[PDB]
Amino acid sequence: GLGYGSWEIDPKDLTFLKELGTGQFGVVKYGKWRGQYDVAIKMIKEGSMSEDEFIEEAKVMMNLSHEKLVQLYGVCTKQRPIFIITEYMANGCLLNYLREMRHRFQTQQLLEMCKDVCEAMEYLESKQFLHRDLAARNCLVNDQGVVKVSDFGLSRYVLDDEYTSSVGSKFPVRWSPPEVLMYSKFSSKSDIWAFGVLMWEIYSLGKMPYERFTNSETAEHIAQGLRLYRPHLASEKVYTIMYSCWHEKADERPTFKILLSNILDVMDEE
Numbered sequence: 001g002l003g004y005g006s007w008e009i010d011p012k013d014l015t016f017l018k019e020l021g022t023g024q025f026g027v028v029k030y031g032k033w034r035g036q037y038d039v040a041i042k043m044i045k046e047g048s049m050s051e052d053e054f055i056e057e058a059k060v061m062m063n064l065s066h067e068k069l070v071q072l073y074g075v076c077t078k079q080r081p082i083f084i085i086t087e088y089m090a091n092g093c094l095l096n097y098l099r100e101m102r103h104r105f106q107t108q109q110l111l112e113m114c115k116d117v118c119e120a121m122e123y124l125e126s127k128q129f130l131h132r133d134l135a136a137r138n139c140l141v142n143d144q145g146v147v148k149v150s151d152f153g154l155s156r157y158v159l160d161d162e163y164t165s166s167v168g169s170k171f172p173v174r175w176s177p178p179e180v181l182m183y184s185k186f187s188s189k190s191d192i193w194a195f196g197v198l199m200w201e202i203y204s205l206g207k208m209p210y211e212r213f214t215n216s217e218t219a220e221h222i223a224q225g226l227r228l229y230r231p232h233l234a235s236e237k238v239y240t241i242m243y244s245c246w247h248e249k250a251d252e253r254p255t256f257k258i259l260l261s262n263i264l265d266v267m268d269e270e
């Protein structure tokens, strides 16, 4: 209504129900919009985000609609703090979900999680939109066990330099190809590399990549041409897919369309 653009939600339409924990921009809550519609509400900590830039980008992000992408419903702007309102994912972060041994996952379920992510990424690739921080920590799981990709592109608005400098203590070294670590060359193919690492995280039930190495050691290992190796739960064909994402030459890495085809082949065969 009157004082609101299409990207803007009236915070007075929110009912807060449960705390969901803290992320990098601060508190996240579960609530309802207009009494009925489940939402997640991110309260953006003052000084954590380039807010005017993020708000302009929210206009673009709201047009990205795919069933395996966590939907952005809008932003509560011109208040402190601002809120980001998104599709609620009742089973929480993928990384924590994988680490819960009670689930006793079959490998068919693990491949389905990879396929869910791959479908989201093929869609983003088709829109020339890079995620820029693909990892299990940035995927969520709904009440049906479907995995969706979250927070796509948001790293561009993070003001904490520890996160944004390749040398910063919070940079995602372990999800980065050599050309990112060496010269900050981001591309579709750096998303591809990250996706390979994410498949490794899924098949490793949420182990940290390069778990025995520091970030500095990881960067040296990768830059010298060495890689992660096969998780016990990955078949040879699954391992071949994740490994293909790690070619030293970025142009020899597959596209998300090719990865999706390869994943569906393995689903049929295995």
Ligand SMILES: O=c1[nH]nc(-c2ccccc2)[nH]1
Residues within 6 Å of the ligand: 020, 021, 028, 040, 070, 086, 087, 088, 089, 090, 091, 092, 093, 140, 150
């Ligand atoms: O953007 C979203 N949607 N849903 C969540 C969520 C986060 C933590 C725990 C449970 C759900 N975050």
